[PDB]
Design a protein around this ligand. Structure first.
Ligand SMILES: Cc1cc2nc3c(=O)[nH]c(=O)nc-3n(C[C@H](O)[C@H](O)[C@H](O)COP(=O)(O)OP(=O)(O)OC[C@H]3O[C@@H](n4cnc5c(N)ncnc54)[C@H](O)[C@@H]3O)c2cc1C
Ligand SMILES: [Ca+2]
Length: 449
């Protein structure tokens, strides 16, 4: 059985391994050069957060141990707000509930090796330009545009948030796209190993500097450096042209003054702020929803190609790897490819919609400069319900991050929990006046184990 995959990223490489291992003849085409060919170019420092959904996908693929050996454990959140050295907010009760910070390039290289070890053939420096579905032929080209045509039988679009496969499908079907732009851009910055140690930055934690309409995060690297991401509006809104935005930060010097004013405890840690600000490109964020993910039995999308989401829940890669497991499962045991692609789409679409929604919602959580007293009291009561009924009351962030519960169910159960806590806390200023056993009875009544 033959399959062509476009995009040797995270989902495309994993699905290539899973199919090749199961006897498929896999050809994988990648626009970029092979990152395993060492050059004299600058290293790639972006990292991301691997959680249970992605880890489990790697586990099934037999690659989890190799990946985790190069990942830094993040035990909890370190929230930096002015005047108060932070304390770790642990993610869970022990080190089984942690998130892993992994270098993106290293992860991609491990997956590339894994796909080839299973028998897939990978062809780099070839970007998909167009698809002729009627003649079953692809057109690819290198950076110079030197075209090259290939016959295909099954086409998997694993080619990212600006997928060319998706574009080609839109020529033969109505994808029913809903693009929702995000006002934040993002900028990568760096904290050196020396600086992070000088300022006693905890390596085994995810760090956040909330600031309302903008914020910075930092994820650790194995060498104690941190990769920092600034999230900030591209443009200053209409009824407030003075508020910060990338448009005001015309160069590295301006970025420094902005950081010294708004992130005074972080600015000293960013030695190369000016250079990194001007060198690294400002990224764009968006949510894109597709009614249609496949064309008959001929082509299917997965990962960012199928459902771009904002990065504020750290689940895009995790979702994409979950996608890859499901697609290989359906393709392996379906009656035919068309049946597989329809069943895969029907299964995954409700969950993709849910994590897209929860990711949007999580920005307020991350960027909030202070938690209202009514927020802390609900959280505290939720903690208590979790101890009495660890089988029933599980905070939504934990369901999303540390379990494989389908995203949609996690969102629905979170809704029940949110309303339960809200009514239970209203008109009570502290825990001592809340009828705790009544709350638990409501938990048991409304949340099945
Ligand atoms: C700032 C930011 C932070 C994030 N943090 C996290 C996080 O902490 N945790 C998490 O789980 N997710 C995170 N994400 C999301 C995550 O990066 C993506 O969801 C994930 O990379 C998607 O995997 P993918 O394989 O579908 O696409 P990609 O990993 O992007 O792979 C696509 C591949 O296709 C190639 N390609 C593109 N176009 C073509 C073409 N025309 N022809 C051939 N090849 C092509 C690309 O070069 C690339 O190799 C973050 C995203 C952003 C923007
Ligand atoms: Ca994400």
């Amino acid at each position: 059985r033959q399959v062509t995959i476009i995009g040797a990223g995270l989902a495309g490489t994993l699905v290539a391994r899973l199919l090749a291992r199961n006897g498929w003849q896999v050809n994988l085409f990648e626009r970029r050069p092979d990152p395993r060919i060492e050059t004299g170019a600058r290293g790639r420092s972006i990292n991301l957060a691997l959680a249970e959904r992605g880890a489990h996908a790697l586990r099934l693929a037999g690659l989890e141990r190799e990946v985790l050996a190069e990942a830094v454990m993040m035990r909890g959140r370190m929230v930096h707000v002015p005047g108060t050295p932070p304390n770790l907010q642990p993610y869970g009760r022990d080190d089984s509930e942690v998130i892993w910070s992994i270098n993106r390039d290293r992860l991609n290289r491990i997956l590339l090796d894994g796909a080839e070890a299973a028998g897939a053939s990978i062809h780099f420096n070839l970007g998909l330009d167009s698809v002729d579905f009627a003649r079953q032929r692809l057109t690819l080209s290198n950076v110079s545009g030197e075209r090259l045509e290939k016959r295909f039988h099954l086409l998997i679009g694993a080619d990212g948030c600006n997928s060319a496969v998706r574009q080609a499908m839109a020529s033969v079907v109505d994808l029913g796209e809903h693009l929702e732009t995000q006002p934040h851009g993002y900028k990568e910055l760096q904290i050196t190993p020396e600086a992070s140690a000088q300022f006693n930055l905890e390596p085994n934690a995810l760090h956040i500097w909330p600031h309302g309409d903008y914020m910075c995060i930092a994820l650790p690297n194995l060498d104690r450096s941190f990769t920092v991401t600034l999230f900030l509006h591209h443009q200053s809104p209409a009824a407030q042209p003075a508020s910060p935005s990338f448009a005001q930060l015309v160069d590295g010097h301006a970025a420094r003054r902005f950081f010294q004013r708004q992130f005074p405890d972080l600015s000293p840690m960013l030695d190369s702020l000016e250079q990194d600000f001007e060198h690294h490109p400002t990224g764009k964020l968006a949510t894109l929803r597709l009614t249609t993910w496949h064309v008959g039995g001929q082509a299917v999308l997965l990962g960012d190609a199928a459902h771009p989401m904002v990065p504020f829940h750290g689940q895009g890669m995790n979702c994409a790897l979950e996608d890859a497991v499901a697609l290989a499962e359906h393709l392996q045991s379906a009656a035919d490819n068309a049946s597989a692609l329809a069943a895969f789409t029907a299964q995954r679409q409700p969950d993709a919609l849910a994590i897209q929604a929860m990711a949007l919602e999580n920005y307020v959580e991350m960027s909030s400069k202070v938690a209202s007293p009514t927020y802390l009291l609900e959280r505290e009561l939720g903690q208590i319900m979790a101890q009495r009924q660890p089988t029933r009351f599980i905070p939504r962030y934990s369901m999303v991050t540390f379990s494989r519960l389908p995203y949609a169910q996690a969102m629905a159960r979170g809704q029940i929990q949110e309303q339960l806590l809200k009514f239970a806390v209203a008109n009570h200023s502290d825990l001592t006046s809340i009828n705790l056993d009544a709350v638990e009875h409501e938990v048991t009544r409304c949340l099945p184990p």
